[PDB]
Structure formats: C-alpha cells, structure tokens
Amino acid sequence: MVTAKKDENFSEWYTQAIVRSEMIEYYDISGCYIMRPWAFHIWEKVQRFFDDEIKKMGVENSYFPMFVSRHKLEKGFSPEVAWVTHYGDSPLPEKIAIRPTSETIMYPAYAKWIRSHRDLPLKLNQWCSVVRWEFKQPTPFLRTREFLWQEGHTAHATEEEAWELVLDILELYRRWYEECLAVPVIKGEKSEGEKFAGGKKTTTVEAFIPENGRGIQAATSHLLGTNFAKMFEIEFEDEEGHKRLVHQTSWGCTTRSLGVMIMTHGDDKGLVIPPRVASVQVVIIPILFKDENTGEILGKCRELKTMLEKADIRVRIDDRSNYTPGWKYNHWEVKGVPLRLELGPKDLAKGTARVVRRDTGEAYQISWADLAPKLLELMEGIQRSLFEKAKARLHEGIEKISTFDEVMPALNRKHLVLAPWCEDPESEEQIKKETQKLSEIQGAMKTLCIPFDQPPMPTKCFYTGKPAKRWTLWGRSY
Amino acid sequence: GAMVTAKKDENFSEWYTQAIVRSEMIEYYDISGCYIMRPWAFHIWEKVQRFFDDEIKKMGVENSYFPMFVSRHKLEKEFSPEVAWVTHYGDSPLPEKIAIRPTSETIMYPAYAKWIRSHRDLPLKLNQWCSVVRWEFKQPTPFLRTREFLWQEGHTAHATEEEAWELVLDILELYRRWYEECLAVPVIKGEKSEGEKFAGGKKTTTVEAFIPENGRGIQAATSHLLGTNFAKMFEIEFEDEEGHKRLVHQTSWGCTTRSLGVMIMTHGDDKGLVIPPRVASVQVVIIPILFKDENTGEILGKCRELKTMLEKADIRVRIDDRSNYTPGWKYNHWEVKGVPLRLELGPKDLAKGTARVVRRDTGEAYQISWADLAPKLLELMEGIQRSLFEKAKARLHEGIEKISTFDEVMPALNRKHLVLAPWCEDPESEEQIKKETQKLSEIQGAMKTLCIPFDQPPMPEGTKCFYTGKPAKRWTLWGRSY
Numbered sequence: 001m002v003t004a005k006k007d008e009n010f011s012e013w014y015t016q017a018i019v020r021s022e023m024i025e026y027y028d029i030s031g032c033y034i035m036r037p038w039a040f041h042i043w044e045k046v047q048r049f050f051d052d053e054i055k056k057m058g059v060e061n062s063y064f065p066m067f068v069s070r071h072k073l074e075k076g077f078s079p080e081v082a083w084v085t086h087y088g089d090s091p092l093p094e095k096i097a098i099r100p101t102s103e104t105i106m107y108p109a110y111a112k113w114i115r116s117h118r119d120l121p122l123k124l125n126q127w128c129s130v131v132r133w134e135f136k137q138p139t140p141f142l143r144t145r146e147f148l149w150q151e152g153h154t155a156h157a158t159e160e161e162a163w164e165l166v167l168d169i170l171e172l173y174r175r176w177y178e179e180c181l182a183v184p185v186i187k188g189e190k191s192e193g194e195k196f197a198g199g200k201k202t203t204t205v206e207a208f209i210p211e212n213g214r215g216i217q218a219a220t221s222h223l224l225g226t227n228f229a230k231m232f233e234i235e236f237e238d239e240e241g242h243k244r245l246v247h248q249t250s251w252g253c254t255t256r257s258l259g260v261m262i263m264t265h266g267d268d269k270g271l272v273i274p275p276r277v278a279s280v281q282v283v284i285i286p287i288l289f290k291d292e293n294t295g296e297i298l299g300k301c302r303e304l305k306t307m308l309e310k311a312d313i314r315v316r317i318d319d320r321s322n323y324t325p326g327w328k329y330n331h332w333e334v335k336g337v338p339l340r341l342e343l344g345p346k347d348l349a350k351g352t353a354r355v356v357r358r359d360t361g362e363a364y365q366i367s368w369a370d371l372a373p374k375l376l377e378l379m380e381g382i383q384r385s386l387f388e389k390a391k392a393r394l395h396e397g398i399e400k401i402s403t404f405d406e407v408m409p410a411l412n413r414k415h416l417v418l419a420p421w422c423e424d425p426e427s428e429e430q431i432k433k434e435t436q437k438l439s440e441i442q443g444a445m446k447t448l449c450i451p452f453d454q455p456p457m458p459t460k461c462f463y464t465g466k467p468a469k470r471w472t473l474w475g476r477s478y
Numbered sequence: 479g480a481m482v483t484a485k486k487d488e489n490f491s492e493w494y495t496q497a498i499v500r501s502e503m504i505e506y507y508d509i510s511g512c513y514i515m516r517p518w519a520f521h522i523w524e525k526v527q528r529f530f531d532d533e534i535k536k537m538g539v540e541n542s543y544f545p546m547f548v549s550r551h552k553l554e555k556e557f558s559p560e561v562a563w564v565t566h567y568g569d570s571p572l573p574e575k576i577a578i579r580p581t582s583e584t585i586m587y588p589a590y591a592k593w594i595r596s597h598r599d600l601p602l603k604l605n606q607w608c609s610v611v612r613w614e615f616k617q618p619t620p621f622l623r624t625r626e627f628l629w630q631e632g633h634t635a636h637a638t639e640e641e642a643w644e645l646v647l648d649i650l651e652l653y654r655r656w657y658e659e660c661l662a663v664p665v666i667k668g669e670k671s672e673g674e675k676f677a678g679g680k681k682t683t684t685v686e687a688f689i690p691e692n693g694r695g696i697q698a699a700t701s702h703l704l705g706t707n708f709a710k711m712f713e714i715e716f717e718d719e720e721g722h723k724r725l726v727h728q729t730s731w732g733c734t735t736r737s738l739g740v741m742i743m744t745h746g747d748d749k750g751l752v753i754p755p756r757v758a759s760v761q762v763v764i765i766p767i768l769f770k771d772e773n774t775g776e777i778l779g780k781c782r783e784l785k786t787m788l789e790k791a792d793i794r795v796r797i798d799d800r801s802n803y804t805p806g807w808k809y810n811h812w813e814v815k816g817v818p819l820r821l822e823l824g825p826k827d828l829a830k831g832t833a834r835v836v837r838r839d840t841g842e843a844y845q846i847s848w849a850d851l852a853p854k855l856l857e858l859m860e861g862i863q864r865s866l867f868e869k870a871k872a873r874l875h876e877g878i879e880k881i882s883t884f885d886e887v888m889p890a891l892n893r894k895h896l897v898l899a900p901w902c903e904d905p906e907s908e909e910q911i912k913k914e915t916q917k918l919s920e921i922q923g924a925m926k927t928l929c930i931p932f933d934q935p936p937m938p939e940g941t942k943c944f945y946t947g948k949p950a951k952r953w954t955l956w957g958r959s960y
C-alpha cells in the first residue's frame with residue numbers, strides 16, 4: 001500500500017501514511033479533515049488518560065458556548081477569527097464569532113462565581129472544537145482550521161499554588177506524549193517573544209521532526225498571573241477581609257499530538273502505533289487456502305482471543321472471508337498494529353503461533369501457553385523501544401554550540417541548536433530576520449524553549465556578544 | 479438566593495429556571511438560546527455519554543469526527559432558516575459562505591459514497607459526538623431546546639434492510655436505557671406518524687417522554703430506518719457477490735443534552751433538583767456538624783475517614799467542610815443541588831459510632847453504624863434510583879387518558895394530560911386535528927401525534943377512528959408538545 005519513502009519526500013509519505021491507514025479523509029473545506037475511526041480511537045485513548053489525570057487534581061469538566069459576541073471578543077489574532085453574519089438569508093443584528101479560544105467566554109463567568117476565598121481554587125477544563133482561519137500551510141492534525149482540544153483554566157489565591165499547577169499540568173503533557181505516544185519532549189520556558197502575551201510565564205513541552213529539522217510545540221501551560229484578573233475583575237476577598245486579584249493558569253493540547261506520533265514512529269511501510277494507544281494491539285490472522293482445516297483454524301483463533309483478553313490485551317480476529325491473508329498482513333501493517341498473530345495448518349498440530357512485531361519485523365514461534373505473558377513482554381518492548389529510538393533521534397538532532405557561525409550548518413543538517421543567549425528582546429527578532437536572509441539566499445529560526453534542564457553555564461551570548469544568561473534551544477518550527 | 483421558592487406545580491417556568499441556576503447547573507449567557515453548562519450538569523452528560531458510547535462500541539459502531547463546516551453547495555444538495563452561515567474570517571470575505579453543521583448527513587454521506595464500493599465494506603457503522611447549531615425559532619429553553627446543543631449522531635449503512643432495522647431497534651433500546659436506567663426517566667417506544675417522521679426516511683422510531691407540570695409530550699431521542707433514498711441521492715452503492723450494483727440500506731439516530739432537562743424536570747420538587755445516584759457527581763455529601771472557629775479535628779478527622787471507606791466502594795463523595803456556613807444552610811444547599819444522600823456527623827454521632835443519613839427524594843432518615851455504611855448506602859442508592867423511576871412511571875401513565883371520540887380531547891388536554899386514541903392514520907386527518915385543536919385552544923395549543931406506541935393496548939374489532947370515524951388501525955399517542 002505505501003510507496004513513498006519517509007526519508008525522501010516526507011510530505012508525500014505523510015499523506016500516504018494517514019490516508020492509506022484510513023486515518024484521514026480529505027475534505028472540500030480547505031484546512032479541514034475528516035478523522036476516521038482509526039485516528040479517532042487514538043484520540044479517545046489520550047483524552048481518557050489526561051482526563052482521568054486532571055480529575056485526580058480536582059479539575060472538573062464543563063462546556064461553555066462556541067459563540068462569542070463581537071463586543072466581548074474585541075475588548076495577529078484578529079485575522080484568524082471566523083464570523084457568523086447570517087441565519088438563513090437573514091442578517092444577524094450583530095455578527096458573532098466562533099470561538100478561537102475561550103478566555104473571553106469563561107472569564108466573565110469567573111468574576112461572577114468568585115467572591116470569596118471559600119471559592120478557590122476554581123479549576124475547570126473543557127473538551128471542544130476550536131476554529132482558526134490559519135494563514136500558514138495547513139497540515140492534517142499538526143495545523144488545521146478546525147481542531148479538537150482540551151483547554152483548562154484555573155484560578156487560585158496565590159502565585160505559589162497556580163505555578164505548582166502549571167508544572168503539574170506540564171508533567172501530564174509530558175506523559176501524554178512520552179508515556180502514551182512514546183514521543184520524547186523537552187520541558188521548558190518560552191522566550192519573552194514566544195510566550196502567550198496575556199500571561200506572565202508560558203511553559204511548554206517541545207518536540208522535533210528529524211525529517212525536516214522542525215521543532216514543534218506539543219502543548220503549553222501558562223502561569224497567567226493577575227493580568228486577566230484585573231482585566232476581568234476576578235477579585236476575591238481573603239479571610240482577613242481584603243480585596244485581592246486571583247492568580248490564573250491555562251493550558252491546552254490538541255489533535256496535533258496524533259500527527260506527531262505518526263511522524264515519530266512511522267516508517268516506509270506506514271504507521272506504527274505504540275501499544276498503549278492502539279485500539280488493536282494484536283491482530284489474529286487465520287490462514288486459509290484450498291480449504292485446509294478451515295473450521296479448525298477459526299475455532300482456535302476464538303480460544304486465543306478469550307485467552308489474551310483475560311490479560312486485557314485488545315485483540316481483533318481478522319476473520320473476514322472476502323480478503324486474502326496476504327491482504328490482511330498488508331492492511332494491519334499499514335495501520336500500524338503492533339503485533340500480528342498468523343495461524344495456518346502447520347501451526348495447528350504444532351501447538352504454536354507465529355507473531356510478527358510491526359516495529360522491526362522480528363518473528364517469534366510462541367506456544368499457545370506462553371503467549372499472554374510473551375505478548376505482554378513484547379508490547380512493553382515495542383513501547384519502550386519506540387520511545388528510546390526516538391529520544392536518540394531527538395538528541396542526534398540537537399547540536400550544542402557557542403557561536404552564531406555554527407547556526408546555518410546545523411540548520412542545513414536539519415538540526416536544532418542549543419546555544420547561550422542573553423534573552424534580550426531584540427536579539428530574537430534580529431536572529432529570525434537574518435536566518436531568513438541567509439535561508440532565502442541558499443527558513444526562519446526561532447526560540448523553541450529555554451529548557452528546564454540547563455547545562456552548566458561557565459560565557460558570551462552566541463549572537464550579541466553580551467553576557468549570556470541561559471541555554472536556549474532554537475530551530476525552524478511549525 | 480439560597481433556596482428554591484417558586485412552587486413547581488404552580489409556577490413551573492420559574493421553578494425550572496430557579497433549580498438549574500441556584501443548583502449551579504447553568505449560567506446565563508449573552509447570546510440567545512446558548513447557556514453555560516457547569517460541572518454539576520456537565521458531569522451528568524459525561525455519565526450518559528460513557529454509558530451510550532460503551533454500548534455502541536459493543537455493537538461494533540465506531541467513532542469519528544467530521545468537520546463542523548459544510549459548503550453551501552454540499553449542504554443544499556436537495557430547515558434553511560435555522561442554518562448559521564459564516565461569511566468572513568477577520569476582515570476578509572469568503573468566496574462562498576460556509577455553514578456551521580446543523581446535522582451531518584451532507585458532510586458524511588458524500589464520504590460514505592467514496593468508501594463503499596463492495597459488499598465487503600458493509601456494514602459501515604459510525605458515530606459522532608459533537609455540537610450542533612440551529613437558529614431555532616421557538617422560545618429557547620435550557621437543555622430542552624438550545625441554539626447550541628451537544629449530541630451524538632449515528633449513521634450506518636447495510637446491505638439489507640432487515641439488518642438495518644435490527645440496528646434501528648437495538649439503538650432505540652439503548653435510548654430507552656439512557657433515559658430509564660441512567661436518568662430514571664420512563665419513556666414510550668413508538669413509530670412516528672407520516673407527518674412527524676423524518677421526511678428523508680422510510681420509518682422513524684422514537685422514545686417519547688411526558689412533562690406533567692405542563693402537560694406536554696417531548697421527543698427524547700430518535701432512530702430512523704432511512705431506507706435507500708439517501709443512498710440514491712448520494713450515490714452510495716455497492717457491488718454485491720454477483721457483481722451487481724445495489725443501494726445501501728441506512729439508519730441514523732441522535733440524542734442530545736435535552737436528556738439532562740427531561741430528567742431535571744421529572745424528579746425535581748419544591749426544594750429543587752433531585753438527581754438519580756447513577757448520574758450524580760456527588761452521591762453522598764458529608765456534612766460535619768460544626769460551627770465558626772471550632773476546629774478540634776475530631777469530626778473532620780472522622781469525615782475524612784468515612785470518605786475513604788465509602789470511596790473504596792466507588793461511592794462518589796464530598797465533604798462540605800466550609801467555615802462561614804451552618805449545617806442547616808448546608809443541608810439546604812445540597813438539597814437544592816439534589817445530592818441524593820446526606821450523611822450528617824456531629825459530636826453526638828461521633829460519640830456512638832454512628833452517622834445519620836437522609837435521602838433527598840423522600841427525606842427518610844436512617845441511623846447507621848460506621849461499619850455498615852458502605853453496604854447500607856449502596857442499598858439506599860439502588861432504592862432511590864428505582865423509586866425515582868417507579869414513581870415517575872406512574873405519573874407518566876396517570877397522565878395518559880384513553881379515549882374514543884374527539885369530544886373527549888379538549889377536556890383531556892385541559893387536565894394537562896396526553897391522549898391515546900384509535901386513529902385511522904390517514905395523513906390529512908393529522909393536519910386537520912392540529913388546526914382544529916389549535917383554534918379550539920385560542921377560544922379557551924395544538925395537539926399533534928407524538929407516537930404510535932409499540933406497546934399497543936387492546937383494540938376490539940370494529941373500533942373506529944376517534945376523529946374520522948373510519949376504521950381505526952392502531953392507538954396513537956397524542957398531546958401538546960415541545
């Protein structure tokens with residue numbers, strides 16, 4: 001099914017991968033796509049995880065409206081907003097905006113529900129769709145005009161507590177990516193120019209696509225401080241009587257996560273799905289031809305299914321009579337099912353099953369008896385091993401450097417760069433403009449993050465010459 | 479403020495509005511027909527959602543997300559005043575306007591035509607959870623009828639009608655369970671009339687509910703045997719075993735956040751909401767009998783212990799350990815919210831190894847040893863759940879008057895009752911009955927068919943249509959409706 005090579009035309013391979021796997025169907029409204037069951041079930045897995053996890057922090061789900069009136073919304077973002085002007089042929093008395101994000105919808109309610117210290121912390125989240133008329137090239141999952149996300153918005157008595165929630169959420173994004181999707185990410189802070197301008201400090205969790213050198217933002221979690229509180233009058237009264245503004249966080253993650261998974265683990269044969277989010281972990285394929293024991297094969301397959309299910313192993317028997325076994329191999333292969341269990345006559349009175357692991361192609365003869373624990377063994381190996389190879393690929397792709405003249409060759413090898421920087425407002429804008437100048441002539445490099453994990457700083461700013469403050473990862477991005 | 483004061487029988491619209499606001503379910507919003515759903519209500523949606531979702535996954539139905547936008551061209555393939563149209567992004571105009579999805583047939587069925595080429599692709603069984611938008615003409619009502627609502631819409635395609643029908647009824651059964659097992663609301667399975675069915679389909683099935691306080695029937699959910707006309711329209715065909723081109727047989731079905739509203743209305747009383755245990759965010763609220771600046775730690779300590787013990791039985795619990803408020807205040811607070819069980823722990827209870835438990839629906843109190851709490855609160859919840867249902871089933875059936883003749887109509891409607899009547903099912907008849915009960919109500923409002931129930935009461939030979947006097951075929955349930 002898949003004929004483009006990941007390492008040759010990466011955009012075509014991507015498109016082939018997501019289409020031939022049946023994850024995505026193309027659509028006539030530019031920048032929008034149909035998520036098919038095979039993609040959708042993966043979303044449900046990660047949604048269920050994060051949701052359970054934030055529930056344990058006392059976050060509660062809600063649903064606020066998708067419309068916001070012009071007046072409330074309009075108290076680089078403006079061009080993106082979709083506006084409803086009519087119902088039927090009738091013009092609205094005033095046009096209304098489809099929500100691009102929900103601060104202006106939720107925060108007036110907050111000012112109202114928060115009167116007393118008794119009322120904090122207020123922690124809410126919502127799963128919804130968001131619409132932005134994106135100017136950049138859209139890409140299925142990574143950047144779409146309608147996407148699905150969660151946005152979580154909290155308010156607290158103290159900077160201390162809100163900040164602690166910020167890091168807690170960021171940890172859960174690392175887990176969404178690293179634990180669920182086996183995609184390695186790097187926690188850090190955003191530069192003053194990349195952060196959410198309505199907040200005090202933006203934390204982020206950053207990913208990398210080796211095949212085009214692009215960094216990509218996996219998720220984000222903001223300490224908002226008191227700015228939105230003053231703007232929206234979210235004041236509260238302490239236990240000593242005084243009238244203080246609240247300290248807020250907000251944080252979101254999207255269907256982009258799926259796109260990043262697909263890009264990280266995919267190969268020339270198509271998708272490869274980490275076991276932890278695969279709706280089919282093991283596919284069973286009865287081998288049938290010239291009528292050899294047709295009934296005996298099928299009967300065992302059902303025994304094995306109930307078997308493996310005793311272990312919470314998600315199993316599907318590909319039982320369908322209208323497709324050949326070779327067809328079934330290719331299908332589940334392109335779909336990225338982690339384990340294929342093949343079973344014909346030879347393996348019937350042999351008491352075994354052949355099992356092929358999607359990541360490497362390695363095959364195992366395994367006795368009916370040893371399967372459940374040996375598949376559990378393998379599924380952990382697949383999952384651990386996808387993450388590990390990816391962390392290695394990520395680290396091969398970051399060059400540590402000290403001087404500006406190292407930049408372009410790193411960027412030409414499609415690598416990020418870790419460099420000491422004075423964290424000056426202008427330097428970043430200058431660096432973008434110049435890296436564009438050089439790329440045009442041969443592409444803008446930006447700040448991706450200031451990582452939490454700072455190496456030792458014995459040192460001059462790699463661009464300005466000034467005294468450098470911290471190590472900052474840069475690159476081309478999405 | 480604190481409590482519900484409008485009486486439920488006597489001031490129904492206002493009771494409703496009070497209960498959903500005071501209880502913290504809903505917050506008003508500046509765009510009409512749209513409302514904020516706070517945790518206290520959202521949790522209930524999450525509950526019915528997981529329930530339904532799990533059941534359809536068992537039937538092999540699979541979830542998807544198709545876009546909320548649809549091109550004007552694709553939407554008007556073949557309601558229009560209800561559609562919301564996007565014309566601009568920022569200051570820039572679109573080449574053509576783009577509609578926000580009002581329902582997804584015109585988005586999904588061209589995709590179905592692509593994906594179905596052969597009998598091996600069948601059956602195709604998809605669902606989606608999404609919001610839907612319609613500029614409703616009628617007065618909006620939180621939950622019951624909103625301009626943004628949440629739903630689930632299912633759309634399947636099959637090789638044979640028989641299989642499609644089997645699914646229509648399976649799904650309809652799931653809707654009965656959604657309302658009856660989850661929400662403790664009784665419903666009546668039935669066939670829509672020719673006039674009230676989905677014009678796009680062969681046969682529409684439904685579950686209908688009844689709201690006694692105002693006498694009006696209300697469609698709780700719907701499941702259609704679509705037949706082959708959409709496949710004809712959208713060119714959804716398949717090559718069968720012998721290479722012949724055939725049209726698929728379709729179903730579609732939906733259920734919305736309306737369900738939360740029908741529940742609220744069914745079990746509420748003058749104190750406010752009453753939430754069935756299967757869906758309540760908090761099932762047991764623990765209320766320590768404390769007062770201002772008393773914090774010895776004995777009582778809270780034991781509340782925290784009790785919570786751990788009940789949580790080990792999967793009971794959902796909250797301790798209301800707030801300082802500025804009395805127990806009496808707290809009692810009322812959680813009654814208004816409809817927490818089904820309140821566990822009271824005072825110094826006196828601490829002294830006996832005992833707690834006092836009061837159940838929201840009846841107010842009956844129980845003294846219970848700490849040891850027994852888990853096993854006795856589980857029993858109590860099953861009893862509340864079941865009692866809410868059985869009492870509402872009875873109010874449903876006491877609200878239905880069987881009748882023989884058209885003269886029995888208006889008296890039955892003025893009692894805020896529905897009517898079950900032998901009906902000849904001829905089409906103009908229904909419209910005549912609408913017009914005629916409309917006019918007769920202004921002079922004192924239209925009665926429409928709600929459903930032809932599956933549960934048909936007996937029909938003696940030679941029975942005649944209550945309205946035309948022609949021979950009656952079956953009983954039809956009629957009333958005022960939402």
Ligand SMILES: Nc1ncnc2c1ncn2[C@@H]1O[C@H](COP(=O)(O)OP(=O)(O)NP(=O)(O)O)[C@@H](O)[C@H]1O
Nearest residue numbers: 141142143144145147217218219220252253254256
């Ligand atoms: N079009 C999109 N499709 C999918 N995910 C997106 C899209 N746009 C943004 N996201 C993700 O949504 C996350 C939270 O939203 P937000 O922080 O507002 O992003 P953002 O500032 O718009 N990113 P960017 O568009 O590059 O400026 C972002 O960190 C992105 O990873």
Ligand SMILES: Nc1ncnc2c1ncn2[C@@H]1O[C@H](COP(=O)(O)OP(=O)(O)NP(=O)(O)O)[C@@H](O)[C@H]1O
Nearest residue numbers: 621622623624625627697698699700732733734736
């Ligand atoms: N405004 C609304 N808010 C919430 N739920 C609704 C609303 N309108 C319809 N529904 C429910 O959605 C279910 C399935 O949708 P659908 O069959 O399209 O409704 P409908 O034909 O528009 N009913 P009606 O609007 O009364 O003519 C219906 O059976 C209703 O119970």
Ligand SMILES: O=c1c2ccccc2ncn1C[C@H](O)C[C@H]1NCCC[C@H]1O
Nearest residue numbers: 077078080100101132151196250251252
């Ligand atoms: O505020 C906007 C925004 C507003 C209008 C149109 C497009 C937008 N794009 C992005 N943003 C910033 C983020 O939406 C802010 C914040 N939202 C809640 C959680 C994610 C975080 O990015």
Ligand SMILES: O=c1c2ccccc2ncn1C[C@H](O)C[C@H]1NCCC[C@H]1O
Nearest residue numbers: 557558560580581612631700730731732
């Ligand atoms: O088709 C429409 C419709 C179309 C445009 C504007 C408003 C509409 N209101 C209702 N309907 C009919 C329902 O959409 C039919 C169908 N919807 C999804 C599946 C359930 C079934 O009721």
Ligand SMILES: [Mg+2]
Nearest residue numbers: 077080132134
């Ligand atoms: Mg953006």
Ligand SMILES: [Mg+2]
Nearest residue numbers: 193194195196
């Ligand atoms: Mg940005």
Ligand SMILES: [Mg+2]
Nearest residue numbers: 557560612614
């Ligand atoms: Mg309607």
Ligand SMILES: [Mg+2]
Nearest residue numbers: 673674675676
């Ligand atoms: Mg109707």
